């Protein structure tokens, strides 16, 4: 009955917002990653790291504001406020990109905090910890995209910047430079995300259209009690429907809900692994057999060769403004263009 | 095109000609499809978290459920009580009819828009 | 010839495609929105060149 | 010396077979283009 | 096409080895019945 147990009591009280031991890590870190993003997006430029406006203050709207990555010249510097780059000057820290590491690092520790919260609340309430487990997928995506990826490259500069349009640019970077759509690990991710949305829609609809008539009224929502032991829809009629419509159906409600965990979690883990490879420029860029025939045979054209012209355009047209530290000068005559355009 | 790389061709050229990324109906589509993947995992993780002990550790938990059994196979109040405390109480469901309608409606509506 | 410019695009497996790069290629720009069933072509060779199968599928 | 008491029968039902077969065939279908390259 | 020759033995075993594993487990499950 020492101070530890008295603090454990106070942390684990039932209040409107549960705190726990995990809240000590989660709550400052989540608040600060979020404050940093709103602070940067409202007030802070990217003129000196990127040559971009990126704040509301500068004239940007919600879709173009971003907290941007530091300059390529910072390498993978932690960019601590008290470190050798900003030397404790808050203004220079903001101008040098310091809020990006701030957000990304307090984000990382927040995500840990959150997952520990899921463990902590599940242990106290007495349920299995599969919600935390599932949340490993968002963690893998975040660390692999925002930490592992730029660490394999030259600098934070090539991480994604925290903004709507900046992420869009990241999507298009990956097409032109990495040919990321051709990557099977991304394809399995796509299949897991879309497979999730599918299963989410089809499961909600099945339950809602196999409901038992448990009330008189036309709003069928009222006829559910959270404490009834009875299932509120017919698994049997649902199984028949889908067996005759689609040829197979679920028959095991426990399998069905595990499958709903499994599919989207897996797909995210798969795309994470592919980004890890892209950290090293280990791309799924080409098919050798295609390039060999294409080179020898000017009549051979596939949608694969068509898409690499597109990526080659993206590279040459976007690179000088997207990588200003490289002083790329491409005179008109070298830019790849088709006829007339 | 009816092909895997053909699809990518189509979506690349679509972006050059229409800036679909900066179109709000495609952004709702992402929110519809990202959102549905999230809730898929949530609902499947929350249900799986609150399965009632019916088996031993040498056997799949799935044999806890028999096709067409009358009683629910998880405890939705244990589920509500976990998720309501993860966020706060009223950000969690405890009407299963409203929960599944929400599951159905979020991705359907978002995909309507992207269509 | 998807784009009407007499530049045919190989979509099928026996013509040097794999599962990833293969496609049924859309019908010719020369046709635009015109209806191109098989019996409107002078032969199946013509119908194949101009992308008839895509419209049918 | 007593026979080992920890042995246990392993099981794979027919639906798990169909699922796993499908997973392996679709995986094979996806990666083969990349193995031939 | 000038495709990699071990691609074929890679694909064949990738299919066969895990398929056979599952077949083995299934059949001996059914003869317990």
């Amino acid at each position: 009955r020492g101070w530890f147990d008295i603090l454990d009591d106070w942390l684990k009280r039932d209040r409107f917002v549960f705190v726990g031991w995990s809240g000590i890590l989660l709550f400052p870190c989540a608040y600060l990653a979020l404050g940093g993003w709103l602070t940067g997006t409202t007030f802070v430029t990217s003129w000196y790291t990127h040559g971009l406006a990126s704040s509301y203050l500068e004239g940007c709207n919600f879709l173009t504001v971003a907290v941007s990555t530091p300059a390529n010249s910072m390498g993978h510097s932690l960019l601590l406020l008290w470190g050798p780059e900003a030397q404790g000057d808050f203004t220079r820290w903001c101008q040098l990109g310091g809020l990006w590491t701030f957000i990304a690092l307090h984000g990382a520790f927040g995500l840990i905090g959150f997952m520990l919260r899921q463990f902590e609340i599940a242990r106290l309430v007495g349920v299995r910890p599969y919600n935390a487990i599932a949340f490993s997928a968002p963690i893998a995506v975040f660390v692999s995209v925002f930490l592992i990826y730029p660490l394999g490259q030259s600098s934070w500069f090539f991480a994604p910047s925290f903004g709507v349009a900046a992420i869009f640019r990241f999507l298009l970077f990956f097409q032109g430079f990495h040919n990321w759509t051709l990557n099977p690990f991304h394809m399995m991710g796509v299949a897991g995300v879309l497979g999730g949305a599918l299963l989410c829609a089809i499961h909600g609809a099945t339950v809602e259209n196999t409901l038992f008539q448990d009330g008189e009224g036309a709003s069928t929502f009222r006829a559910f009690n959270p404490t009834q032991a009875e299932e509120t829809y017919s698994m049997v009629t649902a199984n028949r429907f889908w067996s005759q419509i689609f040829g197979i159906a679920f028959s095991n409600k426990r399998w069905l809900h595990f499958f709903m965990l499994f599919v989207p979690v897996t797909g995210l883990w798969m795309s994470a692994i592919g980004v890890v490879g892209l950290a090293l420029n280990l791309r799924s860029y080409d098919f050798i057999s295609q390039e060999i025939r294409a080179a020898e045979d000017p009549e051979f054209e596939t949608f694969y060769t068509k898409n690499l012209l597109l990526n080659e355009g993206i590279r040459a047209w976007m690179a000088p403004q997207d990588q200003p530290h490289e002083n790329f000068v491409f005179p008109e005559e070298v830019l790849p263009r088709g006829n007339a355009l | 095109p009816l092909g895997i790389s053909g699809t990518f061709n189509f979506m690349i050229v679509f972006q050059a000609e229409h800036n679909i990324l900066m179109h709000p109906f495609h952004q709702l589509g992402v929110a519809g499809v990202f959102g549905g993947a999230l809730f898929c995992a949530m609902h499947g993780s929350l249900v799986t978290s609150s399965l009632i002990r019916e088996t031993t550790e040498t056997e799949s938990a799935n044999y806890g459920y028999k096709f067409g059994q009358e009683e629910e196979t998880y405890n939705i109040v244990a589920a509500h009580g976990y998720f309501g405390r993860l966020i706060f109480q009223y950000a969690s469901f405890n009407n299963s009819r409203s929960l599944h309608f929400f599951l159905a409606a979020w991705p359907v509506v978002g995909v309507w828009f992207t269509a | 010839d998807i784009d009407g410019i007499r530049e045919p695009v190989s979509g099928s497996l026996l013509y040097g495609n794999n599962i990833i790069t293969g496609a049924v290629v859309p019908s010719s720009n020369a046709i635009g929105l015109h209806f191109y069933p098989i019996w409107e072509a002078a032969s199946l060779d013509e119908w194949l060149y101009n992308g008839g199968p895509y419209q049918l599928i | 010396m007593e026979p080992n008491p920890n042995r246990q029968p392993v099981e794979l039902n027919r639906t798990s077979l169909y699922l796993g077969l499908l997973l392996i065939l679709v995986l094979a279908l996806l990666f083969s283009s990349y193995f031939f390259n | 096409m000038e495709v990699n020759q071990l691609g074929l033995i890679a694909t064949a075993l990738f299919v066969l080895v895990p398929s056979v594993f599952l077949i083995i487990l299934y059949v001996q499950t059914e003869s317990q019945q």
Binding site: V236, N239, S243, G247, I248, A249, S251 | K66, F67, G68, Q69 | L13, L14, N18, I19 | N13, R14, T15, Y18, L21, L22, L25, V26, A28, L29, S32, S33, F36 | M1, V3, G7, L8, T11, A12, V15
Partner: peptide, 30 residues
Amino acid sequence: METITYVFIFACIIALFFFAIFFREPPRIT
């Protein structure tokens, strides 16, 4: 040889469809 491989795997998937529908473990009640 690669074409034979792609078409063979596809044909096996179509065959599995057939067994999985017509030769499934039948769902039985309670």
